[PDB]
Amino acid sequence: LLGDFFRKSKEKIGKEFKRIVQRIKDFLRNLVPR
Ligand code: NA
């Protein structure tokens, strides 16, 4: 129960990291004029 709460807190940090990095990648790629 409590262990799962702490684990999910760690997992959420990981998910947010991934989402932010993906957003940055997409943004940078979208900057290149066509
Ligand atoms: Na963008």
CA–CA separation, 11 vs 18, rounded Å?
11
Q: How far does the chain reach from its first CA to its final CA, in angstroms?
A: 52
Q: How far is the CA of 8 from the centre of ligand 1 (A)?
A: 29
Q: How far is the CA of 27 from the centre of ligand 1 (A)?
A: 4
CA–CA separation, 27 vs 21, rounded Å?
10
Write out the DSSP string of 1-21.
-HHHHHHHHHHHHHHHHHHHH
Query: Which approach determined this entry?
Result: X-ray
The residue count of the chain comes to: 34
Q: How far is the CA of 30 from the centre of ligand 1 (A)?
A: 6
Stated in angstroms to one decimal place, the resolution of this structure is: 0.9
